[PDB]
Design an enzyme around this catalytic site. Structure first.
Site, PDB file in Angstrom:
ATOM      1  N   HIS A 178      50.955  55.962  36.284  1.00  0.00           N
ATOM      2  CA  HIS A 178      50.498  55.536  34.961  1.00  0.00           C
ATOM      3  C   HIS A 178      49.678  54.258  35.034  1.00  0.00           C
ATOM      4  O   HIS A 178      48.626  54.157  34.411  1.00  0.00           O
ATOM      5  CB  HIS A 178      51.691  55.332  34.025  1.00  0.00           C
ATOM      6  CG  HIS A 178      51.323  55.177  32.582  1.00  0.00           C
ATOM      7  ND1 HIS A 178      50.661  56.157  31.865  1.00  0.00           N
ATOM      8  CD2 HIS A 178      51.548  54.169  31.707  1.00  0.00           C
ATOM      9  CE1 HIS A 178      50.496  55.758  30.619  1.00  0.00           C
ATOM     10  NE2 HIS A 178      51.023  54.557  30.498  1.00  0.00           N
TER      11      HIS A 178
ATOM     12  N   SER B  90      47.109  53.422  28.129  1.00  0.00           N
ATOM     13  CA  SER B  90      48.291  54.037  27.536  1.00  0.00           C
ATOM     14  C   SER B  90      48.193  54.204  26.013  1.00  0.00           C
ATOM     15  O   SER B  90      47.287  54.874  25.517  1.00  0.00           O
ATOM     16  CB  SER B  90      49.518  53.208  27.930  1.00  0.00           C
ATOM     17  OG  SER B  90      50.724  53.903  27.688  1.00  0.00           O
TER      18      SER B  90
ATOM     19  N   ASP C 217      51.147  61.339  36.604  1.00  0.00           N
ATOM     20  CA  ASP C 217      51.504  60.273  35.681  1.00  0.00           C
ATOM     21  C   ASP C 217      53.003  60.448  35.418  1.00  0.00           C
ATOM     22  O   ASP C 217      53.435  61.491  34.925  1.00  0.00           O
ATOM     23  CB  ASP C 217      50.716  60.422  34.379  1.00  0.00           C
ATOM     24  CG  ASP C 217      50.741  59.165  33.531  1.00  0.00           C
ATOM     25  OD1 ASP C 217      51.814  58.544  33.401  1.00  0.00           O
ATOM     26  OD2 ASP C 217      49.683  58.787  32.991  1.00  0.00           O
TER      27      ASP C 217
END
Ligand SMILES: *[C@@H]1O[C@H](CO)[C@@H](O[C@@H]2O[C@H](CO)[C@@H](O)[C@H](O)[C@H]2NC(C)=O)[C@H](O)[C@H]1NC(C)=O
Length: 317
Positions: free
Chosen positions: A224, A105, A187
């Site tokens: 994610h 991330s 995502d």
């Protein structure tokens, strides 16, 4: 791309040192280290305990990580200092050897922000294995900013932010060291990620950009957190770390590897935790700092985002 000397750190070295930790070793004397840069709302262990810490150990690396306080929710420019300091220390602590940097991330954005503005680390980073990186931020945070429920780093990771604008204009959207970007069109945290082209947030020119669906088909679905813990991700990551080129090789993975579940080599206990990776992060974000403006860019970054507005007003060189 910026060149020359590195910008001064805003934080004291001892403060930056406290955020670095290696498994079973000291950063001053570590063998074959690998730096893990965590995601938003988590500490190093919370991001990688259930996945890349044990997996990298099995690959022959000594996992090291940084845990910028609080939970990677503060100014991204400061989180990067932790990384730059970490690289400098791990490089010298490993006998002056380059080292790989694996991220998740925000951690990818931090690595790229570091390579762009801190020229010294460019010769100390072997390769970059970024999972679900958001170089262009995410459009999904706009609404949160409007209600002022966004932490400093959430403002910065918002598409159109002064930070993402500064990275682009400085040439940070092109790979600086061999880079592999593994992401997913499904995502739920980072968007856009559906075009499998330069429009995607995880795309870097000249890098090994791997959209999972482009390889596993439109029916493949990983979120994610899945982009980091899935078996598919482990195979692509293993390829990137082993590659003589510094990037993941297509010859190392195929449709057989398209397993959306956590990496097979993980213990059942680690698998359950990896499946609930996003839980602690959400908790940290709900309880973390929140503000109504984007943190001011540091002097070295202002020339690249003139006209944008941050907490103190309009940006000027
Ligand atoms: C969070 O980020 C802020 C903004 O960069 C940091 O605050 C700056 O800290 C330096 C060094 O202590 C000061 O010289 C600046 O005046 C501070 N600026 C602002 C706007 O507060 C802060 O230190 C960081 N905190 C943590 C815990 O990482």
């Amino acid at each position: 791309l910026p060149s020359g000397s590195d910008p001064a750190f805003s934080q004291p070295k001892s403060v930056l040192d406290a955020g670095l930790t290696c498994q079973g070793a000291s950063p001053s004397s570590v063998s074959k280290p690998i730096l893990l840069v965590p995601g938003t709302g988590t500490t190093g262990p919370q991001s990688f305990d259930s996945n890349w810490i044990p997996l990298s150990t099995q690959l022959g690396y000594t996992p090291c990580w940084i845990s910028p306080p609080p939970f990677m929710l503060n100014d991204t420019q400061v989180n990067t200092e932790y990384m730059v300091n970490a690289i400098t220390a791990l490089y010298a602590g490993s006998g002056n050897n380059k080292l790989p940097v694996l991220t998740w991330s925000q951690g990818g954005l931090v690595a790229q922000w570091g390579l762009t503005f801190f020229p010294s680390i460019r010769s100390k980073v072997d390769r970059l294995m970024a999972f679900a990186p958001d170089y262009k931020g995410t459009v999904l945070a706009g609404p949160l900013d409007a209600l002022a429920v966004s932490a400093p780093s959430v403002w910065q990771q918002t598409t159109g932010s002064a930070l993402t604008t500064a990275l682009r204009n400085a040439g940070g959207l092109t790979q600086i060291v061999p880079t592999t970007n593994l992401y997913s069109a499904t995502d739920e945290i980072v968007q856009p990620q559906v075009s499998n082209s330069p429009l995607d947030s995880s795309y870097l020119f000249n890098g090994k950009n791997v959209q999972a669906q482009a390889v596993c088909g439109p029916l493949f679905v990983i979120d994610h957190a899945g982009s980091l813990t899935s078996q598919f991700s482990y195979v692509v990551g293993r390829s990137a770390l082993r590659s003589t080129t510094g990037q993941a090789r297509s010859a190392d993975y195929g449709i057989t590897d398209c397993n959306p579940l956590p990496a097979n080599d993980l213990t059942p206990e680690q698998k359950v935790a990896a499946a609930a990776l996003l839980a602690p992060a959400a908790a940290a974000i709900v309880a973390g700092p929140k503000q109504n403006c984007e943190p001011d860019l540091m002097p070295y970054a202002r020339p690249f985002a003139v006209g944008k507005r941050t907490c103190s007003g309009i940006v000027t060189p």
